[PDB]
Design a protein around this nucleic acid. Structure first.
Ligand SMILES: CN[C@@H]1[C@@H](O)[C@@H](O[C@@H]2[C@@H](O)[C@H](O[C@H]3O[C@H]([C@@H](C)O)[C@@H](O)[C@H](O)[C@H]3N)[C@@H](N)C[C@H]2N)OC[C@]1(C)O
Ligand SMILES: CN[C@@H]1[C@@H](O)[C@@H](O[C@@H]2[C@@H](O)[C@H](O[C@H]3O[C@H]([C@@H](C)O)[C@@H](O)[C@H](O)[C@H]3N)[C@@H](N)C[C@H]2N)OC[C@]1(C)O
Ligand SMILES: CN[C@@H]1[C@@H](O)[C@@H](O[C@@H]2[C@@H](O)[C@H](O[C@H]3O[C@H]([C@@H](C)O)[C@@H](O)[C@H](O)[C@H]3N)[C@@H](N)C[C@H]2N)OC[C@]1(C)O
Ligand SMILES: O[C@H](c1cc(C(F)(F)F)nc2c(C(F)(F)F)cccc12)[C@@H]1CCCCN1
Ligand SMILES: [Zn+2]
Ligand SMILES: [Zn+2]
Lengths: 249, 86, 112, 50
RNA sequence: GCGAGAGACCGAUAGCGAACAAGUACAGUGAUGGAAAGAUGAAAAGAACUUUGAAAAGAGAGUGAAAAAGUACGUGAAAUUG
RNA sequence: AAUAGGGUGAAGCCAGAGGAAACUCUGGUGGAGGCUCGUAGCGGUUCUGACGUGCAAAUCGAUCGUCGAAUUUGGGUAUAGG
RNA sequence: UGCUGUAAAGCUGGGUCGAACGGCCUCUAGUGCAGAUCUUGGUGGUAGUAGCAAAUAUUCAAAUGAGAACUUUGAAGACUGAAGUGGGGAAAGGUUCCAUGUCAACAGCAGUUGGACAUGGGUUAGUCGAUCCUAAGAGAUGGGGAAGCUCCGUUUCAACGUGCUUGAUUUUUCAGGCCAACCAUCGAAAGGGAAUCCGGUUAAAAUUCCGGAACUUGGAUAUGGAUUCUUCACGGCAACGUAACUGAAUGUGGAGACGUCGGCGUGAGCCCUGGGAGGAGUUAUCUUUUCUUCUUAACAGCUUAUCACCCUGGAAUUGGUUUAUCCGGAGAUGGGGUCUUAUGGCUGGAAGAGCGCGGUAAUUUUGCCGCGUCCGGUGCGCUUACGACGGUCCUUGAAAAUCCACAGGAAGGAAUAGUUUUCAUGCCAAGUCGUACUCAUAACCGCAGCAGGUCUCCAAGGUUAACAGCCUCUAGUUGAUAGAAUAAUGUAGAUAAGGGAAGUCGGCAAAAUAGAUCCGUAACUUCGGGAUAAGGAUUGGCUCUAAGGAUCGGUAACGAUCAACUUAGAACUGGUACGGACAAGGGGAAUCUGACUGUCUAAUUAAAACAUAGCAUUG
RNA sequence: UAACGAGAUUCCCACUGUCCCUAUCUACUAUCUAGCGAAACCACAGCCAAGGGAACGGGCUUGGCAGAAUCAGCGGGGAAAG
RNA sequence: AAACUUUCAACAACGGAUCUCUUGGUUCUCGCAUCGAUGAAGAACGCAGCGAAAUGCGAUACGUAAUAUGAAUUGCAGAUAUUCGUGAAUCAUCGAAUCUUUGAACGCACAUUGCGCCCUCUGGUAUUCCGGAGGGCAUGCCUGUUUGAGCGUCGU
């Protein structure tokens, strides 16, 4: 047979991300002295669109603590953040929408976004439009905080990890139907080469494990072992179950 | 349309002249000569292509220096000048 | 009607290959090549165009004297009049308010 | 094309120089074998391959 | 590679691809592919001159041992043709 | 970098009319859309037309699909034989 | 010419020819051809045969020449018809360009002609490009893999400056200080980017030469001006103005720098048009006539603007206002100012140029002279540039070089002295490579001078919705073997009594319909459609009538002057014609099937196949 | 299942040379000429009937018969060519 | 009976077999050890009185010097070229030189005849701007020199 499309994606030739029009990576500030011990004030300069991203970005300017120079940061904008607003980041920062605080400083029930998995990684969790992370509980003796993620998973993070108070802006994109192949075309035009998708059962046996036959059909179970090898993992990879979901989960 | 019509769209050179060997085998985008392997330090050659070795090898050029080594060896690699006779 | 040709080797209608049709004293109709339009100098705070500043292609700003490139005021060729006024009042009122916070703090410190 | 490199134009100059008929005084030399220039080239038939 | 001497070898469709301005001419985007083609006569003595023709050429003449050797040149088979 | 000329007439806006109210009706304006008739362009349905030792190793004539976008296209650049 | 042998073969007469060769005894082998769709070369029949038929079309005379259907000149008839058979370029070619000679081969007839052949000539730049910048990307370097060719990394686990500024000192040595986040390099003749125009000139070059007139960058440097004893200028309430009018490190901002569509406004070029002054044409008759010339560059100065802004003032009887509905106590309307100079006006450039006429010098190189070159109008016109607006996206539509400005306040500065070349004038210099020509029914690729293929700019009159079709002007071609005839069968195109799909697998092919105005329009429906459903009527020419505007001037409801093509109606009129050529839907009732727009088997399949939005599942 | 379709199908109206049943006209060929000038194919070749025969002969056997050189057409045969 | 066709013969064609040769090939043997950063092999472009190749050569360009030798070269032309001679011709010999642009290819780059920097001299009134001549600036590694870094570390 032939190398399937699955496998071709990893060589990264025509499947690399289209990044010319992107507006810089969205990260928190580096943990510095000011954020460890106090707070630093910055001002929102711009709220801009990032192609390929559903959420708008905020350009926020900060003074450099150690030399006469202005530092610009690219943040993920939460809803309600406006141009000209002052942003406070640090341990002593107040509990206001857009402020960056350690998770230990936020009370139970706080909604927060762009949350760090590890202390100082500048943000990993709850970054897409409309999503957020909920603070569930604190374990001060272990210096651990328990959070709830957009997928529903519960996780334990260091209380020194940071997050940005509020909900990521741009929420509700998916409530409106795309309606058109052309809208999908323009969507992925600035993301990557993943669209349109040819169905495996519409190919020949060289192309796919689903190819061939005198009718279009899969022919064996579409649930594939986690221990299968590349070229075999097409279908439902290591599925615990299949079929329509009914009842609670 | 893959024959005569398609043959009408040939006006972008894949190869240009190679500085080292001069053949028009210097691939423009790869910046490599398909004939001599320029700009690699070694000359391209293969034992499965003996006739390619014949075309470009020692003795196909001028041999401006090796030409005269055997005469210089024959005289013991002399230094100095010749002497007029009595 | 007389028809014209590009005076340069570029045969394509690009941003840098625009032409104007002019009539010469020889009675001819010729194409004349047009430089790209200049953009206004803009305020560094609000983005509006600045009054009193010449509109030139950026290399040409090194040829004119300083009076065509600035305005006689603080931040003259950089920020517009309203944003300069707004910077002055904000600087005054905040630094006055800082003294009100300093003096009041001492009273809060003194009263207890 | 009109726009051309120095290297190309130098090759074109040499190509013109070699496209000439035999000097007829050559044929008069003692034991001459060349009757004509066998390495002529016409621009429309055989291409230079530069 | 450099210098030599040889052969119950081949003799121009043979012998190296190449006896010759042969790795040439030429082909291919490229890697590569790659021919054909030796011999007038001892000597050019390579036909002065006249004539017909627009000319190429012809007819005389001339050189040569030979033009039944005329740079379509040693001999000059067969197919095929007058 | 390129893409005649028409048809239809979406939101928004103006005016008038009706109604107790909730609301509704009429005339304009406006100029939306992988909308439509149809050039250039791009494509290639049918004649199973021509041609079929061709003009051509895929062409020619008519007929035809589409024609403001998932549109057409130059140049640059990347992906290389299981 | 014969002889010998059953034969494989051997010998001999005659001719041709020119340098070596044979018998016998033995040795040895790359040793014997009719075939292998054998190999290479050569040659027939076919056969003077197939054929040399797309792209409207040629003709008379003269010249030249041995020779003319094919060359040149004149006359004419035509065509392309500005979406060109016109004028240029990019890619590619490479001398094909030009002049002179020239016809063996080539131009599938011919050839005196040629992109052929031969000999020469020809490509001139500070301002046009390349060169430089970065784009996707490519790729060296401390390094980490790999037996290795080499692979990987480029914000790369690295002691990574061939740093810079002054105070000067000459001693070519110093003294300091300031920083080093980033930065090898390559990557665009369409992206970014310092600066040139007009007239003339060659056989062949020109934004490159000549003449005139400028501009840019780099440098030097003098005069004039400006500034300072209130040291680093004044004026304006302000927006801001100006000939100038210190400003280190460092920091910040602007430009470079950006999709697409819609109508509206303005400019320019073109189109149209009145008067006048020249020239041509027509003149049976007429036409204040039909045609043609009347032009103005870069650059310099002054002036010129929508938008934006400032001052005043304080708004409901809400007003201002666009084709498009936004704006105003966060200050409208009103009044007065400021600014960008896109674009236009006047002047210089510049009439000296160019153009149109008229007269001459004369076999003459080349001129020489005079006169005119002027004043208006018009617009849903065409193209293009700019402007102010409006819409649109789960799409929001490059980077870098490079230049300027600000913030900052280091340092240095006047009293009879330093600036400052961001004010004026003057001085010097600008290297390298490309530059001819074709760009295509003959200069490129398709084996070729092949009906194929191959990116782009300019774009006149009439008809019209129209850049379609049809006719025409400028320009360009008149090329494609030709002559004589006009059987059959073809190919391409037409018409046909009566019938009207009986033909055929099948209405295949053809026909029929068709523009515009007015009327009228069903089921069904996702309420958007269906729909040009279906189905009717009208349409020429001429002579009239009515409506729809602009600018000035105080019940102005008015006068005066000007002006564009749309719409509606009536009379008359003809072989009842009239979207008169051109251009230009056939329609209806249903079934199967895919929702739709979209996509693929280059060269036998375009579909019901693929995609798609929507839906679900999985990690 | 509205809308859409160069998709497959049935009927109707209109329309017609598809047909009854053919005729006529034009251009370019074909044709004849001057010039120019290929290719496929080719064991040898080329009139029939029957026989026998590798069971369908141009040739063989027995008969019919049989007169140069040819031109335009033609598609029975050459179990024609590819 | 001609024409036509067929067969033979002669002569003439077409074509290049045959025969004769051979500065070539092919095999065997004998002898020798010598490429390159002191820039090779290879590439490009040039160079002659009249040359396109081949052959030779490098702006000193079908060659310069030197040694030997002793009258040519030659297709034509021509010495301010030569003959009992420092003398014609000569890749005869060869020990001195020249050796464009490149190439392992070395300042950087190279689809560019693109772009720096250092030293000496020199032109334009010039340490800086513009021009000319000559000489320099690659990488890995070795030995050494010099200037340095590290509370790695000794002593005072
Ligand atoms: C001028 N034309 C030349 C011509 O020189 C030709 O030469 C042949 C020549 O080779 C022949 O001569 C021949 O002689 C013998 C024998 C067969 O004759 C051959 O073996 C040999 O190869 C050859 N030299 C000679 N007989 C005729 C020329 N035209 O060589 C080629 C050519 C282009 O046709
Ligand atoms: C299923 N096994 C196949 C096996 O059949 C074989 O595949 C060959 C393939 O290698 C050949 O291909 C080979 O040769 C071609 C060419 C020179 O012909 C090259 O292009 C190719 O690189 C070379 N691998 C291909 N021509 C036929 C397959 N069956 O080679 C191994 C294999 C790929 O696993
Ligand atoms: C135990 N030895 C480790 C040695 O493995 C190494 O650690 C590297 C560390 O330097 C790298 O990290 C480093 O390099 C990455 C680079 C690769 O992108 C940088 O982004 C990062 O800033 C830099 N600190 C880390 N990403 C992996 C560790 N094994 O260097 C540190 C060390 C302690 O010597
Ligand atoms: O835990 C709750 C909570 C909710 C939310 C909300 F859902 F709105 F985002 N935000 C909370 C926040 C907040 F993130 F800062 F807004 C802090 C503390 C508790 C919050 C309750 C809300 C009522 C007051 C007590 N905490
Ligand atoms: Zn090479
Ligand atoms: Zn502002």
């Amino acid at each position: 047979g032939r190398v399937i499309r699955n496998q071709r994606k990893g060589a990264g030739s025509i499947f690399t991300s289209h990044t010319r029009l992107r507006k810089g990576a969205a990260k928190l500030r580096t943990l510095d002295y000011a954020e460890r011990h106090g707070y630093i004030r910055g001002v929102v300069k711009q709220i801009i669109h990032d192609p390929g991203r559903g959420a708008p970005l905020a350009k926020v300017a900060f003074r450099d603590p150690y030399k006469y120079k202005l530092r610009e940061e690219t943040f993920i904008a939460n809803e309600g953040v406006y141009t000209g607003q002052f942003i406070y980041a640090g341990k002593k920062a107040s509990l206001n929408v857009g402020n960056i605080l350690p998770l230990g400083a936020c009370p139970e029930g706080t909604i927060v976004s762009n949350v760090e998995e590890k202390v100082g990684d500048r943000g990993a969790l709850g970054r897409t439009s409309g999503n957020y992370v909920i603070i569930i509980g604190h374990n001060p003796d272990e210096n651990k905080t328990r959070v709830k993620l957009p997928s529903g998973a519960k996780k334990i993070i260091s209380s020194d990890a940071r997050g940005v108070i509020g909900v990521v802006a741009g929420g509700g994109r998916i409530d409106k139907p795309l309606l058109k192949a052309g809208r999908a075309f323009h969507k992925y035009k600035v993301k990557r080469n993943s669209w349109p998708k040819t169905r495996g059962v519409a190919m020949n046996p060289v192309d796919h494990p689903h190819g061939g036959g005198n009718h279009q059909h899969i022919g064996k179970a579409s649930t594939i072992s986690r221990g299968a090898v590349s070229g075999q993992k097409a279908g439902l990879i290591a599925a615990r179950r299949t079929g329509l979901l009914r009842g609670t989960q | 349309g893959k024959g005569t019509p398609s043959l009408g769209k040939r006006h972008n050179k894949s190869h240009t002249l190679c500085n080292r060997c001069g053949r028009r085998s210097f691939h423009v985008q790869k910046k490599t000569c398909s004939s001599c392997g320029y700009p690699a330090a070694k000359m391209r050659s293969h034992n499965w292509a003996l006739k390619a070795k014949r075309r470009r090898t020692t003795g196909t050029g001028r041999m401006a220096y090796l030409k005269h080594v055997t005469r210089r060896f024959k005289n013991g690699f002399q230094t100095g000048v010749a002497k007029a006779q009595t | 009607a007389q028809r014209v040709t590009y005076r340069r080797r570029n045969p394509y209608n690009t941003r840098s290959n625009k032409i104007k049709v002019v009539k010469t004293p020889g009675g001819k109709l010729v194409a004349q090549h047009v430089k790209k339009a200049a953009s206004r100098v803009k305020c560094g705070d609000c983005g509006s165009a600045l009054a009193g500043i010449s509109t030139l292609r950026p290399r040409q700003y090194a040829q004119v004297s300083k009076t065509h490139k600035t305005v006689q005021r603080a931040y003259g060729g950089s920020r517009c009049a309203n944003c300069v006024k707004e910077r002055i009042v904000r600087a005054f009122l905040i630094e006055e308010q800082k003294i009100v916070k300093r003096v009041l703090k001492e009273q809060q410190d003194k009263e207890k | 094309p009109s726009q051309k490199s120095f290297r190309t134009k130098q090759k074109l100059a040499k190509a013109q120089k070699q496209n000439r008929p035999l000097p007829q005084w050559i044929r008069l030399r003692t034991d001459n074998k060349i009757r004509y220039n066998a390495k002529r080239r016409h621009w429309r038939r055989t291409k230079l391959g530069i």
